[PDB]
Amino acid sequence: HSHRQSLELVNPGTVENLNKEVSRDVFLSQYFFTGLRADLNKAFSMNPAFQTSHTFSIGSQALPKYAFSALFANDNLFAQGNIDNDLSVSGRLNYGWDKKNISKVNLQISDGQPTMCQLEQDYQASDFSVNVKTLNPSFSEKGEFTGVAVASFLQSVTPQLALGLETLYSRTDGSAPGDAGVSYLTRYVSKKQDWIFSGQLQANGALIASLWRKVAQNVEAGIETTLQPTVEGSTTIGAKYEYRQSVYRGTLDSNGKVACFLERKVLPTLSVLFCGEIDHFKNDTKIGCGLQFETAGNQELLMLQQG
Amino acid sequence: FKESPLYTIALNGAFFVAGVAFIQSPLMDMLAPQL
Amino acid sequence: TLKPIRVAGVVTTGTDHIDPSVLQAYLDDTIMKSITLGQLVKNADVLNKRLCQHHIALNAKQSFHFQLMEVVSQLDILPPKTFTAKTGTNFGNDNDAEAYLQFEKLIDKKYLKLPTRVNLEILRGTKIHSSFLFNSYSSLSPQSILNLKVFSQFYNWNTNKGLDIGQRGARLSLRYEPLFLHKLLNESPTLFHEWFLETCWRSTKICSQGTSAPYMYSGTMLSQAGDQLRTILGHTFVLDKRDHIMCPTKGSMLKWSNELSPGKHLKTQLELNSVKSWMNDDFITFSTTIKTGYLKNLSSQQSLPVHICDKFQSGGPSDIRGFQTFGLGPRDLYDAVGGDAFVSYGLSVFSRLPWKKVEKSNFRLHWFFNGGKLVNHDNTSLGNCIGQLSKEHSTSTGIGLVLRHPMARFELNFTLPITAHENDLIRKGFQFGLGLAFL
Amino acid sequence: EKRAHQEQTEKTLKQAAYVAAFLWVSPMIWHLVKKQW
Amino acid sequence: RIFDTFPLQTYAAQTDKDEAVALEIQRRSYTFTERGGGSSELTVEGTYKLGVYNVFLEANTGAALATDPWCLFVQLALCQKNGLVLPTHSQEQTPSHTCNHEMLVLSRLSNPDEALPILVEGYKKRIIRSTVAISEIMRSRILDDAEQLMYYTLLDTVLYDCWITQIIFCASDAQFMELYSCQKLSGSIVTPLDVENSLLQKLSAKSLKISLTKRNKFQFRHREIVKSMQGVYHNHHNSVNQEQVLNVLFENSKQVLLGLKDMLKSDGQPTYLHLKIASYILCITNVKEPIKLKTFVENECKELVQFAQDTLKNFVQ
Amino acid sequence: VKGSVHLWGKDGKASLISVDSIALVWFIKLCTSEEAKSMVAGLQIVFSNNTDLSSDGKLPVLILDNGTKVSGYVNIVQFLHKNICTSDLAIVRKKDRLLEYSLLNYVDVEISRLTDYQLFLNTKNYNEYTKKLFSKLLYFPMWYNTPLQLRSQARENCEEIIGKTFKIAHKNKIKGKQELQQVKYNLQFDNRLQSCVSNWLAARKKLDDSVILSSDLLFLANLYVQLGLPDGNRIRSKLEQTFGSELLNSMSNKIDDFVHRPSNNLEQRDPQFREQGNVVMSLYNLACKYI
C-alpha cells in the first residue's frame, strides 16, 4: 500500500453524478415545464439554512395547482419536507456521521398507496466510492431478502479515468427470486478540465455516451447519445450561457425537435422564466412561463437584502 | 441499404462522433460570444 | 413611586401618516390622565401596546426623562403605507395545515381620516378546496375597531371528506376592548367584546360514491344536501387572565358565545380553562378545561330543521382524545347527526423531562383524562335536558408527549377508552394531533 | 426453472463480486504494467 | 392481550334523535301502496326509495307524479313491474307507517353526479343506483326488439333536448325552480321569511340550470350553448346563433310528435315506449307558462293527451 | 332552396376526419330524379374548413342567404326533406318517415361515436394518420390546438363505453402495461360495434332494401372512414367473420360505386375572404366574441 500512495490516486465522484454536468447543468429537460408558475421562497436564517417555498401553478397538469415545501440544513443534517395537493407528502433526511459516511432516508406518502421508504448509505474513500441503497426492505419466513437493493462501486485506476459497476437485485413479492442486473460505468476527465466524457453499458444492452465541454466561464455545451431486435436511439445537443443578468439554455434532438429555456433576473427579488419546446415532425409544441420572488423571513436578513 | 437496428445504432454513433468533432473544432469555440 | 407629576406636552415624531386630531384622542385617553410616575410608566406601556395593535406603528419609542410638570416624547416608525405582500401558514385544529397569500394596503389620511386598512387573501389547505377573503379594518376609536369581511370558500367537512360545503357571503363586526379594567379583573388581563352580523349562502353536497359504502347515504344526510341562505347575529365575550396564550403557567380563561338566527335558532356556548403550576421551575402543571353548549330551535311546531353544520359535534384528537372525529353522539345509520346539548371536560397534567440535558425544552410528559356527552334533547325542558345529560358519559384516558411551541401544539399520545357506546368510533392506541385548540 | 433462476442470480452476483475484486486489484496491476513499459 | 378489556364498560346505542328532521323527511316522502289489498309483505331490507326533483298533483286522477320526464318514466316503470299504485299525498297526511316503497323529494346535490332520479335500496346494507345505472337498467329491457330501440333512442335525444332547451331558456326562473327544485314557496310575499326564500331562488337559479345540462350528455351534444350560460357578457354574437339552434330542435320535435300519433295502440300491458311517451306528454301538459312545445301539444296533438291519460289509469287503482 | 354548404375537405374531396361531409357529397350527387333534384338545386359547395361560420361549432353548415343556419348532416337532410314541392336516392313514404328518422338519429348518436374513437383515441391511427391532415387543412399558427381539442372531445363521448438507469428499466414496464390495456380495449370496441351494427341491420330490414335512403349514406360513410384507416384491417376481419363476407363485399361495392361518381350535380365555389378562416379573420372573430 505504498505505490498506491505514490501514485496519488484522487477520490472519484459519486456514481450517480458521472454525467451530472450534462444531465443537469447543460440540458433543460429537468427544468422544462408548461403553463403559468409562480414561486415565493422565504428564507429565515443563513448559518442554519432554513427556508420555505409556496408554489402556485395553473394552465397545466404536470405542475400541481399549489405546493408547499420547507427545508432546513445545519452543518451535518439536511431535512426537507414537501406537501402537494391531493395530500402527497415527501420527506428527505440526510445525516453525515463523518466526511466519508453519509446516511439518507427518503419517505413518501400518497394517502391511498403504501408508504415508500428508501435508505441509502454512501462511503467516499481516498480513491474509491461505495454506495448501497435499499427500497422497501422485507423478510419472509425463510429469512430471505425482499425488496430492491442497488450496490455500486467506483474506483479511479488513474487520476484521469474511473471505472465502476452497479448491481441491482429486485425481488418484489418474495415468492419468486428477483432479477439481477449489472451495469458498467466509465468516466474520463481531461488534464485541463476543459472537457469530460462518460459511458455506461446496461444489462439489457442499453448504451449511454455523453460528452461535456466548457468554452469559458459563461458558455458550456454537451452532447448525449442514448441507445437500447427492437432498439431505439436518441441524440441530444445542449448549450448553456451563464451571465450575471440572465441564463440561457437551448437544446436540439436528432428527431427534429428543439427547446429553449431562459431565466431573466431583472430585480434582486423577482426573476422571470420562459420555456418553449417545438416538434415540427410530430406537430407537438409546449410553452411555459413562470416567476420567482424571494423574501427574508426575519428583520435582520430583510435589512441585509434591502441594503 | 440495411434498415436494421445495427444500421440505426451505427448511424447514431456516426451522429455522435460528428457532433464530438464539431465540438472539438474551432467552430464551436467561435460559436461562443466574446461576452 | 408616589411623586406628584402633571403631564403637559407631547413631542411626536414620525406621525405624518395619522391625523393629529386622531392621535390626540389616543394620547389624551392613555397618558394625559396620569398623576404619578408609576401610572405614567404603565400608561406609556399601554399606549405602546395599543399603537402596535391598531397598526399605527410597527415600533414605538417613548421618552419621559425630560422635565411638577414634564414633557413626554413619542417616536413612531412609519409603517409602510404602500403594498405589503406576504405568504403564511396556519394550523387548523382538525389536523389540517392551511397556506395563504396576502396583500395589504393602507389608505392615506386624505381619503379617510380614520386609520383604515384593506387586505385580500387567497388560501388553500388540506380540506380547504379554496378560500377568497377580502377584509377591511377601520379604527373608529382607540378602544374600538370595525371589520368588514367578504368571503367565498369551498371545503370538505365530514368523515372521509364525505360532504362538500361551499359558503359565499359577508359579515360586519365591531370589536370593543377597554384600555383599563375596573380594579377587580402587576398583570395585564385581556378582556374584549365582539358583535357581528353575517349573511351567507351555503351549498351542501354529498361528495361520496354510492358504490363505495353506505356511509353518507342515511335518511338524515340525504335531506341535508341543498342550498340555503341565512342571516345571523352574534356576540362573543373573552376574558383571559393568563400569563401566556399558548404556554400557560397560571391563571384562568373564560369564553362566552351567543348566536341568533331570528325565528330559526339560538345557540349558546361557554368555555372555562384553569392552569396552575406547583413546583420550583414549573415542573408539574395541572390544567382543567370544561365546555358546555346548548342549542334551541325557535321555529314553530319544530319546523325548519337546523342544518347539520350548525349542530354540536364531539370526539376527535382535539376535542376528546381516544375517539375519532365526529365519533360521538347519536347516529342515524353510520353518520353522526350532531346534537343539541353538549358537555365536555379535560383534566390534563404536564411534567417536565427529568434529564437535565434536556429539561428546559418545551417537550413534556402528559397524562390526560377526558370525557363528555352529546345529546339531542327534547325541546321541552332544561330540567329534562340536564337529567338526560348527566348519565352514561363517554370517558377516556392516556399518556404521551407534548410540544407546546408558541406557534403550535403537537401531541403524540397512547390513549385508552374507559367508557363508550356500542356505535362510538373508538381509537385505541397511538394518536397524533397538532393545532392550537385542545381540551 | 425456479431454482434454476435462483442459481443464475447467485452466479451473476458472484461474478459481480469477482469483477469488483478485479477492479480493486486493477490499480496495482496497471502500475506494474506502466513500470514494465 | 388486555386491549379486549377496554372499554371497561359499554352502553347501548344512543336512541335520542331530532324530531325536526323526522318531520322534514315525512312531508317529502310519498308512499306506494299495493294493487289489490293489504299493506305489504316486505321487511325494511327489501324496500326502496326513488329520489326525484319534485312532485306535482295532477288535476284528473289526483295522483302525485314527478315533474321530470325521466323521474316520471322511472316511477311508472317501477309501479308496473312491482304492481304498485301511485301515491296521493305525503306521509304527513298519514302519521302511521309501515314497510312500503316510497318516492322521496331530494336535492340534486344528494349524489356526486348531481342528477336525479336515484334509487336507494336496503336499510342496513344500502345500495345507491345513480341515473346512469338506472338508464342502463331500463335500456336493457327493450333490446329484444330492434325497432323499438330506434324509437326509444329518438325520444331521449331529440325530444329530450327540445324539452331541456325550452325549460331552461324560454321559461322564467319562477317556472324552472317550480319543477327542478325542492325549495319551499308560498306564492305571496307577506312574511319576512318569504322575502328570504325569493332571494335564494334568484341567487341559485343559474347554478341549478348548469347541473341539469349534464344528465344525458346534453353538454356534449350542445357544447356551444352550455358555455354561454357560464359567463356574463350578453353579447349578440352568441344570442343569434343560440336561437338558430333552438329553432331546429323545435322543428325536429314536431316531426317526432306527429309521427308518434300513428302508433298508439296498446293491446294490454303498455311497453316501455308507451310509458316514455306518456311521461313526456304528462310533464309538458303541466307547465303553466305558454311555451311553444306546450302550445303545439295542446293545439295540434289532442290525440296524444288522451293516450297519456289512458295509460295513467292503469296505475291509479 | 338557395344557399351554401360548408364542409371539411380539400380540392374537391371531403377529408376522412368528418364522416358527415363525406356523406353530404354522396347525397347531392345522388339527387337525380325530378322530385329529388329540386331538393338540392341551388346549393353551392364550399370547402371553407373554418368552424367560425357554424352556429354550433360543427363544420357541415347550410346557410340560406339570410342567416338561417342548419348544422349537421341529419339536421340538413331533415330540413331539405320538408322543402319538397311534391308535384338512386329515394324519398320515403309518409308511413315510413318516423322509422327513417329513428335510423338516421341512431346512426348519428351511436355508430358515429365509434368512428371518433378510431380516429382519435386509437394511438396507432392518431399518431400515424390523424395529425397529418390538420397541418394541410388549417393555417400555420392554428395547426396544433384543433387535434388536441378533437382528441379531448372524442374521449368525453366514449368514457362509459370504452374509456439510475435501472430505475428507467423498471419504469419500462409501462410499455407492456399499455400494450395489455390496448389489447383489453380492442375487445370492448369490437363487442360494442358488433352490437350496434347488428341492431341497425335488424331495424333496417323493416324498410325497403331495394332503394338508397339518407340513413344508408351515413352508415356507409362510417364504414368507409373506419376501413380506410391504417388499423382498419382488424376491423374488416372482425366484422366479416361475424356478419358475412358477401354482406361486407356488397357494402364495400356500394361504397366504391359512391366514391367513383362523376361530379356533375356537385358545383364547388372558391371560399371568399370573409369565409377564409386565416389569421386576420381568426383575430377578428376572437375580438367579436368578447365584445
XYZ file of N, CA, C and O in Angstrom, chain E residues 13-94:
328
model
N -76.715 1.732 22.246
C -76.667 2.827 21.289
C -77.612 3.945 21.713
O -78.692 3.706 22.258
N -77.192 5.181 21.456
C -77.964 6.342 21.874
C -79.183 6.500 20.972
O -79.047 6.655 19.754
N -80.374 6.462 21.570
C -81.619 6.407 20.815
C -82.308 7.757 20.665
O -83.359 7.823 20.019
N -81.762 8.827 21.237
C -82.346 10.147 21.055
C -82.062 10.656 19.648
O -80.931 10.581 19.162
N -83.100 11.167 18.992
C -82.984 11.650 17.626
C -83.776 12.939 17.476
O -84.744 13.180 18.202
N -83.351 13.765 16.524
C -84.008 15.044 16.293
C -85.381 14.823 15.674
O -85.538 14.013 14.755
N -86.379 15.545 16.178
C -87.741 15.429 15.677
C -88.071 16.458 14.608
O -89.065 16.289 13.896
N -87.275 17.519 14.480
C -87.465 18.452 13.378
C -87.031 17.848 12.051
O -87.550 18.235 10.999
N -86.095 16.900 12.083
C -85.665 16.229 10.861
C -86.667 15.158 10.457
O -86.986 15.008 9.273
N -87.187 14.405 11.429
C -88.141 13.347 11.116
C -89.410 13.899 10.482
O -90.055 13.210 9.687
N -89.786 15.133 10.821
C -90.915 15.775 10.162
C -90.570 16.264 8.763
O -91.444 16.268 7.891
N -89.323 16.683 8.534
C -88.901 17.098 7.201
C -88.924 15.942 6.211
O -89.389 16.111 5.080
N -88.427 14.770 6.614
C -88.451 13.591 5.752
C -89.846 13.008 5.609
O -90.071 12.163 4.733
N -90.797 13.445 6.430
C -92.151 12.917 6.385
C -93.063 13.710 5.462
O -94.061 13.163 4.979
N -92.749 14.976 5.200
C -93.508 15.781 4.255
C -92.925 15.742 2.850
O -93.514 16.319 1.933
N -91.787 15.075 2.663
C -91.150 14.948 1.361
C -91.148 13.513 0.850
O -90.431 13.208 -0.106
N -91.930 12.628 1.464
C -92.000 11.229 1.073
C -93.440 10.846 0.764
O -94.364 11.233 1.485
N -93.622 10.084 -0.312
C -94.934 9.645 -0.774
C -94.933 8.128 -0.893
O -94.029 7.558 -1.505
N -95.953 7.481 -0.339
C -95.946 6.033 -0.169
C -96.651 5.332 -1.327
O -97.760 5.715 -1.711
N -96.003 4.302 -1.871
C -96.595 3.442 -2.890
C -97.362 2.314 -2.209
O -96.777 1.530 -1.454
N -98.657 2.224 -2.485
C -99.488 1.174 -1.918
C -99.625 0.007 -2.893
O -99.380 0.134 -4.093
N -100.023 -1.142 -2.353
C -100.180 -2.343 -3.160
C -101.452 -2.272 -4.001
O -102.401 -1.546 -3.691
N -101.459 -3.048 -5.086
C -102.552 -3.034 -6.050
C -103.875 -3.494 -5.452
O -104.832 -2.717 -5.375
N -103.940 -4.752 -5.025
C -105.200 -5.334 -4.609
C -105.645 -4.937 -3.218
O -106.646 -4.232 -3.056
N -104.908 -5.379 -2.207
C -105.272 -5.085 -0.836
C -104.134 -5.407 0.101
O -103.167 -6.081 -0.268
N -104.265 -4.914 1.323
C -103.251 -5.080 2.343
C -102.248 -3.939 2.329
O -102.290 -3.033 1.496
N -101.328 -4.000 3.292
C -100.264 -3.005 3.366
C -99.056 -3.433 2.538
O -98.706 -2.768 1.557
N -98.430 -4.548 2.910
C -97.293 -5.116 2.194
C -96.880 -6.400 2.902
O -97.407 -6.747 3.965
N -95.928 -7.101 2.295
C -95.256 -8.250 2.886
C -93.750 -8.077 2.782
O -93.021 -8.995 2.393
N -93.264 -6.889 3.128
C -91.875 -6.509 2.932
C -91.230 -6.165 4.266
O -91.884 -5.621 5.162
N -89.950 -6.491 4.392
C -89.146 -6.042 5.517
C -88.420 -4.751 5.147
O -88.424 -4.312 3.996
N -87.786 -4.135 6.150
C -87.094 -2.871 5.929
C -85.910 -3.025 4.986
O -85.392 -2.025 4.478
N -85.461 -4.255 4.740
C -84.338 -4.504 3.848
C -84.751 -4.699 2.396
O -83.877 -4.753 1.524
N -86.046 -4.800 2.112
C -86.496 -5.076 0.763
C -87.153 -3.902 0.068
O -87.479 -3.983 -1.121
N -87.354 -2.807 0.792
C -87.983 -1.622 0.232
C -86.943 -0.730 -0.437
O -85.743 -0.829 -0.177
N -87.423 0.148 -1.316
C -86.562 1.115 -1.978
C -87.230 2.483 -1.964
O -88.436 2.609 -1.739
N -86.417 3.507 -2.200
C -86.863 4.891 -2.258
C -86.371 5.514 -3.555
O -85.197 5.371 -3.911
N -87.271 6.195 -4.258
C -86.960 6.849 -5.521
C -86.749 8.337 -5.270
O -87.687 9.042 -4.883
N -85.522 8.807 -5.479
C -85.205 10.212 -5.316
C -85.460 10.977 -6.598
O -84.871 10.675 -7.641
N -86.334 11.983 -6.507
C -86.803 12.763 -7.644
C -86.670 14.246 -7.317
O -86.505 14.638 -6.161
N -86.741 15.073 -8.365
C -86.558 16.512 -8.196
C -87.693 17.131 -7.389
O -87.452 17.865 -6.424
N -88.937 16.848 -7.766
C -90.100 17.435 -7.111
C -91.319 16.597 -7.474
O -91.211 15.572 -8.151
N -92.488 17.038 -7.011
C -93.739 16.309 -7.198
C -94.861 17.304 -7.461
O -94.921 18.367 -6.833
N -95.749 16.965 -8.396
C -96.958 17.731 -8.658
C -98.161 16.799 -8.630
O -98.064 15.621 -8.988
N -99.299 17.334 -8.199
C -100.548 16.581 -8.132
C -101.387 16.923 -9.359
O -101.806 18.072 -9.530
N -101.637 15.926 -10.203
C -102.375 16.158 -11.435
C -103.857 16.373 -11.146
O -104.391 15.911 -10.134
N -104.517 17.092 -12.055
C -105.897 17.507 -11.816
C -106.875 16.351 -11.985
O -107.856 16.250 -11.239
N -106.633 15.472 -12.959
C -107.630 14.464 -13.310
C -107.714 13.367 -12.253
O -108.738 13.218 -11.578
N -106.645 12.591 -12.092
C -106.656 11.465 -11.166
C -106.251 11.844 -9.748
O -106.507 11.068 -8.822
N -105.625 13.002 -9.553
C -105.206 13.421 -8.235
C -103.959 12.745 -7.711
O -103.585 12.983 -6.556
N -103.303 11.914 -8.516
C -102.104 11.226 -8.072
C -100.923 12.189 -8.013
O -100.956 13.296 -8.555
N -99.865 11.748 -7.341
C -98.638 12.522 -7.212
C -97.617 11.993 -8.209
O -97.197 10.835 -8.117
N -97.220 12.838 -9.157
C -96.297 12.456 -10.212
C -95.080 13.367 -10.184
O -95.183 14.552 -9.865
N -93.924 12.810 -10.524
C -92.714 13.612 -10.587
C -92.799 14.624 -11.726
O -93.481 14.406 -12.731
N -92.101 15.745 -11.559
C -92.163 16.853 -12.504
C -91.178 16.723 -13.659
O -91.173 17.583 -14.546
N -90.349 15.685 -13.675
C -89.371 15.474 -14.727
C -89.741 14.244 -15.546
O -90.217 13.253 -14.983
N -89.572 14.287 -16.874
C -89.942 13.116 -17.688
C -89.210 11.844 -17.301
O -89.831 10.778 -17.246
N -87.911 11.926 -17.002
C -87.169 10.729 -16.619
C -87.653 10.175 -15.286
O -87.848 8.961 -15.146
N -87.846 11.048 -14.296
C -88.327 10.600 -12.996
C -89.713 9.977 -13.108
O -89.989 8.945 -12.486
N -90.594 10.583 -13.906
C -91.938 10.038 -14.072
C -91.911 8.703 -14.811
O -92.675 7.790 -14.479
N -91.039 8.569 -15.815
C -90.912 7.297 -16.519
C -90.411 6.200 -15.589
O -90.922 5.075 -15.614
N -89.418 6.510 -14.753
C -88.914 5.515 -13.811
C -89.985 5.156 -12.788
O -90.135 3.988 -12.411
N -90.754 6.149 -12.331
C -91.840 5.877 -11.394
C -92.883 4.950 -12.002
O -93.318 3.984 -11.360
N -93.297 5.222 -13.242
C -94.283 4.370 -13.900
C -93.738 2.967 -14.136
O -94.462 1.980 -13.966
N -92.467 2.856 -14.532
C -91.875 1.539 -14.742
C -91.825 0.741 -13.445
O -92.127 -0.459 -13.434
N -91.442 1.388 -12.340
C -91.422 0.703 -11.051
C -92.820 0.279 -10.624
O -93.007 -0.826 -10.104
N -93.815 1.146 -10.829
C -95.184 0.787 -10.472
C -95.682 -0.386 -11.305
O -96.411 -1.249 -10.801
N -95.311 -0.431 -12.585
C -95.753 -1.522 -13.446
C -95.076 -2.835 -13.077
O -95.733 -3.878 -13.001
N -93.759 -2.804 -12.852
C -93.023 -4.037 -12.587
C -93.455 -4.679 -11.273
O -93.632 -5.901 -11.204
N -93.623 -3.879 -10.224
C -93.976 -4.389 -8.906
C -95.475 -4.388 -8.640
O -95.899 -4.840 -7.574
N -96.284 -3.895 -9.575
C -97.716 -3.859 -9.361
C -98.179 -2.851 -8.335
O -99.247 -3.028 -7.749
N -97.404 -1.797 -8.100
C -97.758 -0.813 -7.091
C -98.858 0.116 -7.606
O -99.384 -0.042 -8.710
N -99.204 1.098 -6.778
C -100.218 2.096 -7.096
C -99.652 3.471 -6.770
O -98.977 3.647 -5.750
N -99.919 4.439 -7.645
C -99.358 5.771 -7.485
C -99.836 6.402 -6.178
O -100.970 6.173 -5.745
N -98.991 7.199 -5.529
C -99.394 7.850 -4.278
C -100.448 8.919 -4.524
O -100.831 9.218 -5.656
N -100.928 9.495 -3.424
C -101.884 10.593 -3.487
C -101.541 11.775 -2.594
O -101.997 12.888 -2.885
N -100.754 11.588 -1.538
C -100.356 12.682 -0.662
C -99.143 12.240 0.143
O -98.784 11.061 0.170
N -98.513 13.209 0.802
C -97.300 12.944 1.558
C -97.622 12.246 2.875
O -98.751 12.280 3.374
N -96.594 11.618 3.449
C -96.760 10.840 4.670
C -97.184 11.684 5.862
O -97.656 11.121 6.855
N -97.035 13.009 5.794
C -97.541 13.858 6.865
C -99.057 13.785 6.975
O -99.609 14.133 8.023
N -99.741 13.342 5.917
C -101.178 13.120 5.997
C -101.524 11.788 6.650
O -102.680 11.584 7.036
N -100.553 10.883 6.779
C -100.754 9.574 7.399
C -99.618 9.320 8.381
O -98.592 8.724 8.024
